[PDB]
Amino acid sequence: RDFTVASPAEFVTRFGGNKVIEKVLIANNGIAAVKCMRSIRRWSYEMFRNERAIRFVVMVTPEDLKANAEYIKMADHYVPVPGGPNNNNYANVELILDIAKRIPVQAVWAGWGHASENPKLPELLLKNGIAFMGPPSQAMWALGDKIASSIVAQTAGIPTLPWSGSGLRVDWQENDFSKRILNVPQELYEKGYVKDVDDGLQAAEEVGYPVMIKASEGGGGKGIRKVNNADDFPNLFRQVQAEVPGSPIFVMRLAKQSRHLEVQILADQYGNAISLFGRDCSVQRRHQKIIEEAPATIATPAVFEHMEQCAVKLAKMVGYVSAGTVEYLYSQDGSFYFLELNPRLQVEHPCTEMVADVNLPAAQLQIAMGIPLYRIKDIRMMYGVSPWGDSPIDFEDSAHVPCPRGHVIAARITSENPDEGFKPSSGTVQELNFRSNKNVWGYFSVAAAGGLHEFADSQFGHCFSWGENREEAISNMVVALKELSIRGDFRTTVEYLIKLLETESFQMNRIDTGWLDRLIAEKVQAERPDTMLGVVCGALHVADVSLRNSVSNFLHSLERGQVLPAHTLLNTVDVELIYEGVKYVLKVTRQSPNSYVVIMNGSCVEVDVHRLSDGGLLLSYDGSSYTTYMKEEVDRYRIT
Amino acid sequence: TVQELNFRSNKNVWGYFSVAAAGGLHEFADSQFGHCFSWGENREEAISNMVVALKELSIRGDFRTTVEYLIKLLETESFQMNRIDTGWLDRLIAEKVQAERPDTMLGVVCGALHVADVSLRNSVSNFLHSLERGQVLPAHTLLNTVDVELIYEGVKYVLKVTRQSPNSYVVIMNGSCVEVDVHRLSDGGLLLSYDGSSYTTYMKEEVDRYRITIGNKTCVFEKENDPSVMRSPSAGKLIQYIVEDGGHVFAGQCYAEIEVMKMVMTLTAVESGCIHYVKRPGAALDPGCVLAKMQLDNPSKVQQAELHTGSLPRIQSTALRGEKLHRVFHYVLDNLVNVMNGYCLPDPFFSSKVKDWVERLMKTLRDPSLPLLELQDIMTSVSGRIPPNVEKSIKKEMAQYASNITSVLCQFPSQQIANILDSHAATLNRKSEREVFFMNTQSIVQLVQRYRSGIRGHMKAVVMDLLRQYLRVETQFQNGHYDKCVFALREENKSDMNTVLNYIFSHAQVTKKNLLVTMLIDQLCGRDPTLTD
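Predict the joint structure of the above. Result:
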């Protein structure tokens, strides 16, 4: 408790780094930018007693400015860039370099946006003396496409693979650095890629019926064919060969319906790599993550520790720094398969922060300054060592010391529309109120003022809940989701998440990567109010708008000296509403300014209605009170 | 009332409030409208979490909101060392510890910008509304310069605010200017860029004060109403005074009779004191003019002037001095275009920078390296969706052009780039391989079209286009008086009144524009007595 730092220079000196970072460029937007700035600023206050010791520069398009993106106000400096698709603003590595040198910055963070999948950016930055908070390009190359990934995984402790073209491997390089030279593995590439019509069949004979054939440039709905038969392989195979003519094609075995696990790997620039903890990410819709859970509770200790060891060995031999994820496919009988390494920080990384008491983006910053792992505070605590010291950590001997604290659920809030599929929606926000509580938090890339524009991706917010175990975390998440209010022009998938968390299959942890797909085809978009209440509420909203407009227009006429007759100031409104094919016709009148009467087929009900300052109505109907809102569309009424 | 309530929660921090963004606090509604909580492993971590969280929240409304004081307390060493007692805060209160103020210079600039922006937007709105109704106001009620006066800690600051563009503001004090980049936010605030640093700011106008929020710090400026000078609220004429010169008047008593509108309006005194009249009975009145002084007992606010006479901070400039040369093109050209649209500095500042803009543009347009730099940017931004054949050819051609710089036979290969692209289009891939090529190559097409005749033709084209801007406006205000010309424009542009306003606004600064016109003629048709058609 004798450390006295005020500037990053002194910190680097004391902790044994070699590069000072005072300015960081964020080549990202939305959630990533928000999260980076916030986490690092917390750490900055912790060490320097100055929340703004590290300045953050952001690149702003006119779209994000007009939409009042949240990260803009947080940033220290902004520079405008050209708008439009990602290749003009954020995926343009040369532009990133141009800004990084125009505004003298010492580092560039990319995160999980659009440039962190381009191996050319670390080269461009390192050639100019700029520290990239991520892997070097040589790793990202060695971690290239899929054939090279499957091959290189087998050079050290061999993870099982579902015949990535075949099960053949290369020589042993347990802890040596190597590049993907096409001299030895070329044979594997020749087996991993196919040329003739009958080349692919040689895989089908060994893998079995569920064969997946994809072009080297396949994706986006084309270049992919799933063969379910044995004799129909030539048809869809030749189809893939025609989907991307001239390009090499590859054949692989299709996955079974099982679990998708992840391991979070963190590493310094001195060859030390550690496994933090895992994640269970098996709630997916069309291969898109929806809900993530931090303790990988499905895997037993033995097999899970094995998966951790394999992930670390890969990171060490390939030469990966800062942070990344290794994906595994976990079968129900205790057998894992390698899938791929993601060379960048994931959006769902707080899941492992919350159970490890670490800060990953700050750790990336400290790594970028050249600080080894045994001098970073949180790591030192994680292995049971005094934070204020410099003693080394034997990471292999003390690898049993780290232990997760609790259980975390992360639910992402998307902008899709569960009604009629999952079409992405967009528009303005009218209210964004997330009521936090003990062990619950969350954050969003947009505020109440502002919106989501055409080029603004989905996933505009993330909620997290902690508990001692699975059940408590579920409970916290469900309640918190039921308590938040999001209102706007766009649609906001929240209610569907609630319905999923209340489903017994989830709560008993009996799910797989095809769970949600099956549920979608079964038409599970429930969580509707009772019909009678909805009819009454919609009637009241329509009638109240009509009555208020009548009053406003009539009074305006009176102010101007015109007299309208006393039948344009009506107190009765006819409302018609169709629900599930059934037409309802109602009359709405009033016995007082606040007492409304809804009449249908000669029967009447009384409702106490009060106008709220926020545009909604407070109802008292049958004892129970309700808060309601309406939005009128071209051909629909949306009643909340 | 509440205007915004955003508590950014985080790990180990939460809180809750009894009121939402819509809603408010009424008379019988007690204090303590919300609570924040922070957890940590020990005392220090908990403090850190609380401090950061408090610095990140945003509460805005009519009421005042004690948060900054809590921050100051948590950052006090006596708290952190846990050396406090039940009388700690009382002692600190008596020591006048209400700190956490922004720097004065920044606060002055920000308040100036808010005041001026409100005045400018009101001018625009009222003028445009008049145009919609068929009224024509003269072109001195649509001003681009605002005078702002702000008192801070007894010191009076007097500033002028103008604009060089819709987003570029200039604050002038005592002959020194600073440039600020201002963007309007949808939430009512302003985004500033001042000296590199960016700021988010908000303003609330009170009866006699301006409340300026900069980030999470608050600064309050006093609106001068202290000298106790009676002033005419409007234009008009003075008819008579009601009371004797030197007589005592009481607040609420009428002291003078004036007439504007051919309709008589009296004038009540604000304060009780001895009145002496400045204007003699029968006189022209201007709004805010000096009519009559009153002697009071001077309770306070004596000599709250000490007019600041210095200079505002000036480190940066954003002039792109030696930065890439093709960005400088855009910079200077856009400044000159905005001059042509009526955005012009005041007297001693105009033509002190415009001449430099012209000179820098002329140098840039004669540099052979400009078009290839443009090509670099547009080609690099689109790596994918371009056939490799055309990509390789273009890279080769531009490399050749670079090799021939500084040679009398050096010409930009616009035709050759166009040739290879048209060759690929002559192959004409069908069905989504057609349109992708024609669309992802549009930037290149634009570039080559601009430089069909080389840098010479491009230079002449740019300067000509500016001259055309001039004529586009000034040929409409010939043939008669101001209002007649405006009515002609109104009757042509029936469906849009912003166009009409733009014509008027740019016409207002005709003299400064003419200076620029002459400078652009002399640099084009000077020592080269030839004229193309």
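Residues 531-559 of chain A form the longest helix (29 residues).
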